[PDB]
């Protein structure tokens, strides 16, 4: 006697074969069914188009992570500001989707529509640019970058509050979330529960702070904080939305004239106009796009905070044009191992709410 969750429309998409054993209110026997292999057979530059494919909503977190680790292995400002801006923009796009998705999953539609309008403003900022590369970035933004983010940053802080205005003063959502979704902080650490799912439960360990990457050190970010539940994980992400918007404002301000990718010819490739004057640039251009570059023989793993948890690329390089083995530390897979424990004894309609709060995407998991 079980409930086979899905098999296509559980409440949104995914796919799901969450064979939920039940007895009223019991045993989550999931089944999460070769990117790991395909990446091996692909050059470092080629793995960029593959990278964004995993977590589609916060694709840039995937890009940054991978690009960073590859940078560290290889040893490669106004470009680092663009990343901090884009990482947070993709964090706003990824936070919007999840808040709404979960607001839709158990409860009503309405917030989801609003979520999507601001998303359409970011996808427009995504079509305008395309973006991240191992040297830096594909190309420069535009003169219409500065004045456009402000129009989005002004007509967002209000909008961020209407979604909150409805949810903070939770109608049924308070009765449905408040106790549900048991996450002991010790046991979250024992189950390796990534977080923003971990920081709501009380523990204050986030990669952006513990191990700050490019331009995140120089930017002023606030302290988002009670009891490991769906409601408090849901609300922390709403505060995270406003602090992200404050990073976007703070990073839009600190944007002067600069180059976009690492000048070392063996890495990147920024000629575009120089293809007509230099010989070393074509011999290089042809070679980078045919063979590529061979990194140093050794292991590397650089972690980056995604809005869906802990993103890390474990790249073993055997001095080849391609990575010898690229194992992506899956935030959504790590978080899901705590479902059989968190949803144990919980309700069936709440078993949908307990899943949306985890902030999962199947593309990242598998």
């Amino acid at each position: 006697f079980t409930i086979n969750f899905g098999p296509q429309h559980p409440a949104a998409h995914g796919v799901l074969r969450l064979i939920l054993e039940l007895s009223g209110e019991x045993x989550x026997x999931x089944x999460x069914x070769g990117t790991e292999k395909l990446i091996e057979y692909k050059t470092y530059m080629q793995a960029l188009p593959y990278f964004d494919r995993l977590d589609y909503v916060s694709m840039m977190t995937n890009e940054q992570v991978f690009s960073l680790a590859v940078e560290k292995l290889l040893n490669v400002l106004r470009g680092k500001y663009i990343r901090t801006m884009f990482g947070e923009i993709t964090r706003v796009l990824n936070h919007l989707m999840s808040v709404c998705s979960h607001a839709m999953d158990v409860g009503a539609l309405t917030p989801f529509l609003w979520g999507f309008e601001e998303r359409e403003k970011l996808m427009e900022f995504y079509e305008r640019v395309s973006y991240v590369r191992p040297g830096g970035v594909s190309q420069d933004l535009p003169a219409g970058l500065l004045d456009d983010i402000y129009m989005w940053a002004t007509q967002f802080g209000d909008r961020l509050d209407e979604i909150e205005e409805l949810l903070t003063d939770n109608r049924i959502w308070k009765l449905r979330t408040v106790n549900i979704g048991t996450v002991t902080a010790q046991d979250a650490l024992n189950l390796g529960l990534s977080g923003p799912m971990l920081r709501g439960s009380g523990i204050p360990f986030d990669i952006r702070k513990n191990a700050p990457y490019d331009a995140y050190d120089k930017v002023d970010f606030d302290v988002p904080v009670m009891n490991g539940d769906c409601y408090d994980r849901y609300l922390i992400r709403m505060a995270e939305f406003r602090q992200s918007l404050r990073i976007i404002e703070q990073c839009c301000n600190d944007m002067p004239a600069g180059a976009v990718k690492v000048e070392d010819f063996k890495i990147n490739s920024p000629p575009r106009n120089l293809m007509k004057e230099d010989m070393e640039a074509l011999i290089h251009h042809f070679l980078l796009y045919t063979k590529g570059y061979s990194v140093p023989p050794g292991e590397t793993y650089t972690a980056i905070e995604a809005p869906k948890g802990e993103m890390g690329v474990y790249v073993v390089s055997d001095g080849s044009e391609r990575p010898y083995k690229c194992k992506i530390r899956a935030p959504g897979f790590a978080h899901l191992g705590a479902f059989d424990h968190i949803a144990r004894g919980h309700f069936l309609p709440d078993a949908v709410a307990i899943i949306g709060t985890m902030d999962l995407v199947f593309g990242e998991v598998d």
Partner: protein
């Protein structure tokens, strides 16, 4: 004979409105969400009701989970019960308010039947229970309004009401909280869908769905209208009827027309507003978690109204 045209027109109208109301909820909610509902299917968007309800019948689609012909029978009873409730409005019926109570008693029977897969049927029993709770609530309220009145005929209540939703504002608020709880925010979540079961609504299958939603919205227009006669303003500008409203009628001239219309336009306005409340309550909405709806009514709303029975006659004998 003459009555055949009087019944026909009315029912054709009722059905017309039922069909359009689907498109209404659509457009209204889209306005809330900053979007537009059925943009083309019109002109206006009038032909989204028809061209859709025509498309489910043309599909013309059955699993042993529900007995052969009992599978497409609850679809018939849900509509047949809704048919009676509208027809029982037009006619006077000397004992009318406990004729309205006979139909909402008999409507629910189709839910217990609907699924009678083991577990899906279990899910049906939940809704069966859920409905049963608020159906008891409404009766408690019907009864309170009869306490104030004593005359069981619906008409006497409709006509009796220079006040209606002034004393009974709290009661009416509780009526809408139950009137919606019988079908919209909870039932939308009470559907559950675990897994597939039952898509958007009760395994539709086509074209039984056409009579289902034509018992849903139909028994939302009648469910709100019913609330209107009992609790709300069941026709006319009463402040004017107190201030000497006759002026406009007496100075109008003579035709025996527009006087019969005024009231219908007022009731139309009432149901329109109640429907809008229904439009937004579906928007604002959150969870239901069946046990978290059983707890709400049995332990709270039900004993709240009980205490009211221990006030109405006491303050009547005061």
């Amino acid at each position: 004979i003459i009555n055949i045209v009087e019944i026909l027109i009315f029912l054709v109208c009722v059905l017309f409105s039922v069909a359009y109301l689907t498109v209404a909820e659509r457009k209204t909610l889209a306005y809330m969400q900053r979007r537009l509902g059925p943009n083309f299917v019109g002109y206006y968007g009038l032909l989204q009701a028809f061209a859709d309800a025509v498309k489910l019948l043309l599909x013309x689609x059955x699993x042993x989970x529900x007995x052969x012909x009992x599978x497409x029978x609850x679809x018939x009873x849900x509509x047949x019960x809704x048919x009676x409730x509208x027809x029982x409005x037009x006619x006077x019926x000397x004992x009318x308010x406990x004729x309205x109570x006979x139909x909402x008693x008999x409507x629910x029977x189709x839910x217990x039947x609907x699924x009678x897969x083991x577990x899906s049927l279990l899910g049906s029993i939940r809704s069966t229970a859920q409905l049963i709770s608020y159906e008891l609530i409404l009766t408690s309220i019907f009864i309170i309004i009869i306490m104030f009145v004593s005359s069981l005929n619906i008409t006497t209540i409709i006509x009796x009401x220079x006040x209606x939703x002034x004393x009974x504002x709290x009661x009416x608020x509780x009526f809408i909280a139950s009137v919606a709880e019988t079908a919209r925010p909870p039932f939308d979540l009470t559907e559950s869908e675990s897994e597939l079961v039952a898509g958007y609504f009760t395994e539709x299958x086509x074209x039984x769905x056409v009579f289902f939603f034509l018992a849903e919205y139909s028994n939302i227009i009648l469910i709100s209208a019913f609330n209107g006669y009992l609790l709300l303003g069941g026709x006319x500008x009463x402040x004017x009827x107190x201030x000497x409203x006759x002026x406009x009628x007496x100075x109008x001239x003579x035709x025996x027309x527009x006087x019969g219309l005024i009231n219908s336009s007022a009731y139309a306005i009432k149901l329109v507003f109640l429907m809008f409340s229904f439009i937004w309550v579906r928007a604002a909405x959150x969870x239901x978690x069946x046990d978290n709806l059983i707890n709400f009514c049995w332990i709270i709303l039900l004993p709240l109204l009980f205490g009211i029975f221990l006030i109405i006659p006491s303050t009547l004998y005061i």
